[PDB]
Design a protein around this motif. Structure first.
Motif, short mmCIF file in Angstrom:
data_model
loop_
_atom_site.label_atom_id
_atom_site.label_comp_id
_atom_site.label_asym_id
_atom_site.label_seq_id
_atom_site.Cartn_x
_atom_site.Cartn_y
_atom_site.Cartn_z
N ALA A 1 0.81 -1.21 0.00
CA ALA A 1 0.00 0.00 0.00
C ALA A 1 0.85 1.26 0.00
N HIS A 2 2.11 1.18 0.41
CA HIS A 2 3.02 2.32 0.45
C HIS A 2 3.79 2.52 -0.86
N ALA A 3 3.47 1.75 -1.90
CA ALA A 3 4.12 1.95 -3.19
C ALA A 3 4.00 3.40 -3.63
N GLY A 4 5.09 3.92 -4.17
CA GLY A 4 5.11 5.25 -4.72
C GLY A 4 5.80 6.28 -3.85
N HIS A 5 6.14 5.95 -2.61
CA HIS A 5 6.92 6.85 -1.77
C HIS A 5 7.90 6.04 -0.93
N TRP A 6 8.88 6.75 -0.37
CA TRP A 6 9.86 6.13 0.51
C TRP A 6 9.21 5.80 1.85
N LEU A 7 9.66 4.71 2.45
CA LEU A 7 9.15 4.26 3.74
C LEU A 7 10.31 3.92 4.66
N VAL A 8 10.31 4.52 5.84
CA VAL A 8 11.23 4.17 6.92
C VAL A 8 10.48 3.24 7.85
N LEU B 1 15.14 1.21 5.13
CA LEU B 1 14.64 2.20 4.19
C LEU B 1 14.13 1.48 2.94
N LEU B 2 12.82 1.62 2.66
CA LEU B 2 12.13 0.95 1.56
C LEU B 2 11.84 1.97 0.46
N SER B 3 12.32 1.69 -0.76
CA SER B 3 12.14 2.60 -1.88
C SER B 3 10.68 2.66 -2.30
N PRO B 4 10.34 3.61 -3.19
CA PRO B 4 8.97 3.66 -3.73
C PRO B 4 8.54 2.42 -4.48
N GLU B 5 9.48 1.55 -4.86
CA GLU B 5 9.16 0.28 -5.50
C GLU B 5 9.31 -0.91 -4.56
N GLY B 6 9.43 -0.66 -3.27
CA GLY B 6 9.43 -1.75 -2.31
C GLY B 6 10.74 -2.45 -2.14
N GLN B 7 11.84 -1.86 -2.58
CA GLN B 7 13.14 -2.47 -2.36
C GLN B 7 13.74 -1.96 -1.07
NA NA Z 1 7.46 1.98 -0.30
#
Ligand code: NA
Ligand code: NA
Ligand code: NA
Ligand code: NA
Ligand code: NA
Length: 157
Positions: A27-34, A125-131
Motif C-alpha cells: 500500500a506504500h508503493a510510490g513513496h519512501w518508507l522508513v 529504508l524501503l524505496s517507492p518500488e518496495g526495495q
Molecule cells: Na514503499
C-alpha cells in the motif's frame, strides 16, 4: 540495489496499526518508507527513538517519505504510547512477529542458561518500488533518526 530480499508475501501481510486501521507494505508503493523496529513500548530507549523521529517528521515529509514504528506490543499499548508521546506517525502492532521475522530482526542470545529470542532494534529504508535499500541493525538510539534522515536524503536524490 537491494540489501535484503523479503518474501513476496511480506508485502501483503495486514499490519495492525495504532488507531485501529491496517496497512500493508504494498500500500506504500510510490513513496519512501522508513520502518523502525524497537523492542518495547514506553521504555526509555524506545521512547527516545520515537520522539527523535517525531521531531524530524517535517524533514521526512519534504523528502517524500513516511515512517512506521514496529514492535510486538498490542494496539492498545501502541495507542497509549502514541497519545502520551504525541507521535504523528503510526505504530505497527506486530503481535505475531510476522513482519519482524520477514526483516530477520528476531535474534537469539545465549543467556540465563537458555536460548532467548528478542527484537533487535533495527531500521530499514524501503524505496517507492518496495526495495530494501539500506539497513541498520543493532541500532544505538543516539543520533540514529538524524542518520536515517541523512541516508534517505542521499537515496532520494
Ligand atoms: Na514503499
Ligand atoms: Na488489525
Ligand atoms: Na495484526
Ligand atoms: Na530502530
Ligand atoms: Na547498513
Amino acid at each position: 540495489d537491494a540489501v535484503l530480499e523479503l518474501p513476496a508475501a511480506t508485502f501483503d501481510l495486514p499490519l495492525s496499526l495504532s488507531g485501529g486501521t491496517q496497512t500493508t507494505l504494498r500500500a506504500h508503493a510510490g513513496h519512501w518508507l522508513v520502518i523502525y523496529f524497537y523492542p518495547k513500548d514506553s521504555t526509555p530507549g524506545c521512547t527516545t527513538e520515537g520522539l527523535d523521529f517525531n521531531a524530524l517528521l517535517p524533514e521526512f515529509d519534504k523528502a517524500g517519505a513516511k515512517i512506521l514504528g514496529v514492535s510486538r506490543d498490542s494496539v492498545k499499548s501502541h495507542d497509549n504510547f502514541c497519545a502520551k508521546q504525541g507521535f504523528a506517525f503510526p505504530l505497527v502492532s506486530d503481535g505475531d512477529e510476522a513482519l519482524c521475522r520477514a526483516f530477520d530482526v528476531i535474534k537469539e542470545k545465549n543467556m540465563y542458561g537458555k536460548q532467548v529470542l528478542g527484537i533487535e532494534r533495527s531500521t530499514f529504508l524501503l524505496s517507492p518500488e518496495g526495495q530494501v535499500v539500506q539497513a541498520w541493525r543493532k541500532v544505538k538510539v543516539a543520533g540514529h533518526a538524524d542518520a536515517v534522515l541523512a541516508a534517505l536524503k542521499a537515496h532520494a536524490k
